[PDB]
CSV table of C-alpha atoms in Angstrom, one decimal:
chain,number,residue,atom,x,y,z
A,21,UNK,CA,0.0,0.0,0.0
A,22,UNK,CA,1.4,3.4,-0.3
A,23,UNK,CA,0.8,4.3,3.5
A,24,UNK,CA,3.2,1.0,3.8
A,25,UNK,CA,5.6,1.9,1.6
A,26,UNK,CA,5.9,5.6,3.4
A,27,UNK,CA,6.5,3.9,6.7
A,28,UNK,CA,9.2,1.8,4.7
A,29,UNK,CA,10.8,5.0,3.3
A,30,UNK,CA,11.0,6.5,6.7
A,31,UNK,CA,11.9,3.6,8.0
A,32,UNK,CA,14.6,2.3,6.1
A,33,UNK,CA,16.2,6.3,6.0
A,34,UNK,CA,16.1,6.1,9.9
A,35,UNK,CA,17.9,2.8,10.6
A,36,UNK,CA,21.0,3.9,7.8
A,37,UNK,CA,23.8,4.6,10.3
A,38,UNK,CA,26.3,5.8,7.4
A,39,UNK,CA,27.7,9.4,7.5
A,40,UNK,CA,27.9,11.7,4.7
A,41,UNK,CA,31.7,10.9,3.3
A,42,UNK,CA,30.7,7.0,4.0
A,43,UNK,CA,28.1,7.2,1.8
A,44,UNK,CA,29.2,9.5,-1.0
A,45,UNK,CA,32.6,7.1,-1.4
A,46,UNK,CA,30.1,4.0,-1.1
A,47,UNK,CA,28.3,5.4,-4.5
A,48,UNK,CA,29.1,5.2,-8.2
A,49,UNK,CA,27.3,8.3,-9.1
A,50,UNK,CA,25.1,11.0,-7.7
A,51,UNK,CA,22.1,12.8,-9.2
A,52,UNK,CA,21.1,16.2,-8.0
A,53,UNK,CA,18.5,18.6,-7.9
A,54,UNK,CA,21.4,22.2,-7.5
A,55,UNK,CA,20.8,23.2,-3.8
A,56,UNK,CA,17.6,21.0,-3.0
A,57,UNK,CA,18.4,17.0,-3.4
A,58,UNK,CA,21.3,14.9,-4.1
A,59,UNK,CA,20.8,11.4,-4.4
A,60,UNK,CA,23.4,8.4,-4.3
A,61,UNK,CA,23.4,5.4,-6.7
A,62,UNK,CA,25.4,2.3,-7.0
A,63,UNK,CA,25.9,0.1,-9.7
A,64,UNK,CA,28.5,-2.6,-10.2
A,65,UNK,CA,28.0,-4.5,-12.6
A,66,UNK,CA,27.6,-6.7,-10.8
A,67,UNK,CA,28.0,-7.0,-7.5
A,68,UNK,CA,24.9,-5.7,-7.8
A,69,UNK,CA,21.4,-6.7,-9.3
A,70,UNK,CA,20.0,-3.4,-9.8
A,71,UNK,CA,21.2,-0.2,-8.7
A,72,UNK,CA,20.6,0.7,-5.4
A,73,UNK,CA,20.1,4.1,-3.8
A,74,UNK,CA,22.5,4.7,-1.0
A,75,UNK,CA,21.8,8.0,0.3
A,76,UNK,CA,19.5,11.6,0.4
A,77,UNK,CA,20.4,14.3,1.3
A,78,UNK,CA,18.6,17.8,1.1
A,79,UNK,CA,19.3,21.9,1.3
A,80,UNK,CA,22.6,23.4,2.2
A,81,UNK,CA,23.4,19.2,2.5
A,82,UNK,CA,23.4,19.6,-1.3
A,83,UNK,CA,26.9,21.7,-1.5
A,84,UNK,CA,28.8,19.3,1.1
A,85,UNK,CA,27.9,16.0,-1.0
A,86,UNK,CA,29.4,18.1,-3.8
A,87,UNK,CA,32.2,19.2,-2.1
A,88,UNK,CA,32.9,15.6,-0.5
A,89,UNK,CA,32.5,13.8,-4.4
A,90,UNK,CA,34.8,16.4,-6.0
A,91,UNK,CA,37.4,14.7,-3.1
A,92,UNK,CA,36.1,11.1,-3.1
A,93,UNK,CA,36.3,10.9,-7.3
A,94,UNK,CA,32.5,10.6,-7.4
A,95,UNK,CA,30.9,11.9,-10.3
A,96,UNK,CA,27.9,13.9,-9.6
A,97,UNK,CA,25.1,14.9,-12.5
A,98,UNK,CA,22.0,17.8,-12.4
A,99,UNK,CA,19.5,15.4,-13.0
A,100,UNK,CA,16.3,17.1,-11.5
A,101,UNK,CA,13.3,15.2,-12.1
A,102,UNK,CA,15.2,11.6,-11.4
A,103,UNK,CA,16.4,13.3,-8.4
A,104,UNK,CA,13.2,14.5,-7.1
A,105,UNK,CA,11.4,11.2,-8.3
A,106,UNK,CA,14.1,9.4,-6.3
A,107,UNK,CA,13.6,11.3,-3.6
A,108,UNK,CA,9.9,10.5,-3.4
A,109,UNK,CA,9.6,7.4,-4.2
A,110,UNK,CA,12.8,5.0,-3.4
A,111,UNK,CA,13.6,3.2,-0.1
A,112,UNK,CA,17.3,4.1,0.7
A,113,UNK,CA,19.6,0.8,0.7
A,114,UNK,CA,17.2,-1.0,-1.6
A,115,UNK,CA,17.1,-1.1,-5.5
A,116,UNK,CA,15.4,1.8,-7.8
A,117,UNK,CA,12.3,2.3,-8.0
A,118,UNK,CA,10.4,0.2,-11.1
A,119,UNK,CA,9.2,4.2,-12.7
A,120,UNK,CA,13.1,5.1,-12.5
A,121,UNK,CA,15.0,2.0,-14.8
A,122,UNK,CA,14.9,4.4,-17.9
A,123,UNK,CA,16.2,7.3,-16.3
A,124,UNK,CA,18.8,5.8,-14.3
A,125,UNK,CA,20.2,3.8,-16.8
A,126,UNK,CA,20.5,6.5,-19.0
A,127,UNK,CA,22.4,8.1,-16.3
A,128,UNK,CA,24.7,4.7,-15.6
A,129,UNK,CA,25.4,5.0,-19.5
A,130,UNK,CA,26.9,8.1,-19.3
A,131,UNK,CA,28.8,6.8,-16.5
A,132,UNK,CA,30.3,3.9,-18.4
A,133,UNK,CA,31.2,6.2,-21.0
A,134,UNK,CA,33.9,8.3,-18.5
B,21,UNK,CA,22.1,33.3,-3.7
B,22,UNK,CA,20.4,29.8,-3.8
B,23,UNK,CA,23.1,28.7,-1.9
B,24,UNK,CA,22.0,31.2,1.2
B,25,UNK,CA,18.7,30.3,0.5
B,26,UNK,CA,19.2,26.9,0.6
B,27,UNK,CA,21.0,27.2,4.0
B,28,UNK,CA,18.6,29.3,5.5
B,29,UNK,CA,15.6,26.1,4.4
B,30,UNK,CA,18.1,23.8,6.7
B,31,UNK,CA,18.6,26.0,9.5
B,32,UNK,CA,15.0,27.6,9.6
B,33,UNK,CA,13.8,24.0,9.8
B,34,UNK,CA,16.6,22.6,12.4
B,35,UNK,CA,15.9,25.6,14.7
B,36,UNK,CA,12.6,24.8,15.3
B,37,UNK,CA,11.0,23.5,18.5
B,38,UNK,CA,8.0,22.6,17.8
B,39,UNK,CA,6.5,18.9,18.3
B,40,UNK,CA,3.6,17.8,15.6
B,41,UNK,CA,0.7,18.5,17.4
B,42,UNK,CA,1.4,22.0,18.1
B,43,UNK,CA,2.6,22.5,14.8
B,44,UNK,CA,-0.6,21.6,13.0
B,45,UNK,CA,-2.9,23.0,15.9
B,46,UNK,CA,-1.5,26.7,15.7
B,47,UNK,CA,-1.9,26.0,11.6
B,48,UNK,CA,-4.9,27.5,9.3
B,49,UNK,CA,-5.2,24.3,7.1
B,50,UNK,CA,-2.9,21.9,5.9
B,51,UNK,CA,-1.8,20.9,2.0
B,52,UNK,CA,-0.3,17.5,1.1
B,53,UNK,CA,0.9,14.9,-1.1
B,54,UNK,CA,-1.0,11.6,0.4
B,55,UNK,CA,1.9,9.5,1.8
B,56,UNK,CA,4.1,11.8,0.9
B,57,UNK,CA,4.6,15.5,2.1
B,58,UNK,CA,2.4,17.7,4.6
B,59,UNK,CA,2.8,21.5,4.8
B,60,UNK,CA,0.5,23.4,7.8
B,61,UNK,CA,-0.2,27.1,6.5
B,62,UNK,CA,-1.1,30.0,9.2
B,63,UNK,CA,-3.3,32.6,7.8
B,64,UNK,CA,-5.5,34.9,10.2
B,65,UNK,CA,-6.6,38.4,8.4
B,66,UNK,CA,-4.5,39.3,10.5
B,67,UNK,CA,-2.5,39.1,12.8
B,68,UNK,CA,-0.6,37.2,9.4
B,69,UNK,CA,0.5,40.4,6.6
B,70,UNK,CA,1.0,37.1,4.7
B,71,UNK,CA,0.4,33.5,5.1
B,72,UNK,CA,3.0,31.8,6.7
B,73,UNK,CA,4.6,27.5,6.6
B,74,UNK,CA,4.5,26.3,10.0
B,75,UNK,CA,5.6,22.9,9.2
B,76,UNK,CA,6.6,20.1,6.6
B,77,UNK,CA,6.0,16.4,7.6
B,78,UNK,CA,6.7,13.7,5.2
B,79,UNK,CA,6.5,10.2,4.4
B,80,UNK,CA,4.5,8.2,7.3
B,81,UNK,CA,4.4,11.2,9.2
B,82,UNK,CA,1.8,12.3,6.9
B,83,UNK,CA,-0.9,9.6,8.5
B,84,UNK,CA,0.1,11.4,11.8
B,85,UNK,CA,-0.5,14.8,10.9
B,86,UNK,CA,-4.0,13.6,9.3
B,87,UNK,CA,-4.7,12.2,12.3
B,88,UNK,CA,-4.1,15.0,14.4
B,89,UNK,CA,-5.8,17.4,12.1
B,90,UNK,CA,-8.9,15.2,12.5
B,91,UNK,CA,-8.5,15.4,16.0
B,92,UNK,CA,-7.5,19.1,16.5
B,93,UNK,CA,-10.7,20.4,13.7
B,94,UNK,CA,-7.9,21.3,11.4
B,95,UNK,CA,-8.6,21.2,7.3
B,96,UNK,CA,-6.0,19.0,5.2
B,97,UNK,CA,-6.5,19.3,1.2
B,98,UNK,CA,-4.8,17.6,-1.2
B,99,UNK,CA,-2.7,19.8,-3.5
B,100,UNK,CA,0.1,17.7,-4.7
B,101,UNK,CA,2.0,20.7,-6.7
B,102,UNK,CA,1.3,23.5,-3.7
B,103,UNK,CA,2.7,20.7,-1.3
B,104,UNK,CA,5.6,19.9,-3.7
B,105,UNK,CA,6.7,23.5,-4.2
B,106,UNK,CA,6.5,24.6,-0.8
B,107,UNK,CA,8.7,21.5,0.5
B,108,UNK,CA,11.4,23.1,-2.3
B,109,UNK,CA,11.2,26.2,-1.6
B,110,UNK,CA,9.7,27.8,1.3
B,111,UNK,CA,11.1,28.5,4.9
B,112,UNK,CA,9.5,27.7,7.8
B,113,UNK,CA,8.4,30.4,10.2
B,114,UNK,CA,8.6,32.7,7.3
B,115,UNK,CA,6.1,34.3,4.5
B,116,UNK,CA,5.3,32.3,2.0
B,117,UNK,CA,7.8,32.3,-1.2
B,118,UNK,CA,6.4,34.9,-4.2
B,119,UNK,CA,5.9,31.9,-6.8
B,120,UNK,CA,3.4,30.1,-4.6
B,121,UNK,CA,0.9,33.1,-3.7
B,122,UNK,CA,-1.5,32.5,-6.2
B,123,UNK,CA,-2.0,28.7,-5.2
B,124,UNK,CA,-1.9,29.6,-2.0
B,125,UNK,CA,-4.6,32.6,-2.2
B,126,UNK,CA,-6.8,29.5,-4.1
B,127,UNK,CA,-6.7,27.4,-0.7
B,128,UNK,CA,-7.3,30.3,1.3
B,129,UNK,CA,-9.9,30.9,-0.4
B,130,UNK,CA,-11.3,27.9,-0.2
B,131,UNK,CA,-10.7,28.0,3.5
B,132,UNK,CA,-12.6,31.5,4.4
B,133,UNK,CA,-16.2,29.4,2.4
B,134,UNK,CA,-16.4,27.0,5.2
């Protein structure tokens, strides 16, 4: 149900006992609504079924994830609607979001390409 | 700068002290996302020059403000894009931001017929 999956959500951000650094290194790429969301996904291929979302983070947040990928290597991307539909919709630690395949593997594309 | 901006959001909202209940019982009505986002708007002509966010809930915390509201004779309407774009970009304990006075004139409109 969607109440369900709102607890899970909430839930599953709650119980993440990562910090910021932890979890930008952990990622292969972040997506990013400038100054409002940023967003962590990893994909190994594979390591890893689907790509997973491994963090969110919101507001003045935004410019430390930035800061700490610029140091870690991690490529970050203005991505605003996949950022804002990830942030709405997927579970943190869990794999995307069925509505978010296309857009996120376009963005794992252009990853594969650097 | 939206930088500024966007660290004024984070501390406006960390600087609160506020629990739930007392946040939607001092608001005028409520707009949200269902499972998703819950923003309380104050608005007494006035008292209020403009209307102002007293809160944003979100995920399962959304059942819990609906609840309250029930309880504490407060309205809740559903206005996804309202709810969206003041999660973005408003402050709380502050005016509401220039882009969303139209939308928001609409609910409090709605709000002064019943």
């Amino acid at each position: 149900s969607p109440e369900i999956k709102s607890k899970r959500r909430q839930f599953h951000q709650e119980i993440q006992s990562r910090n910021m650094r932890e979890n930008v290194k952990r990622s292969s790429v972040v997506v990013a609504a400038p100054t409002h969301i940023a967003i962590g996904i990893l994909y190994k291929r594979g390591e890893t079924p689907l790509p997973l979302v491994t963090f969110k983070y919101t507001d003045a947040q935004v410019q430390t994830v930035r800061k700490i990928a610029e140091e870690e290597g991690v490529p970050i991307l203005q991505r605003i609607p996949l950022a804002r539909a990830l942030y709405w919709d997927a579970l943190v630690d869990h794999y995307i979001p069925a509505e978010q395949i296309e857009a996120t593997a376009e963005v794992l594309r252009w990853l594969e390409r650097q």
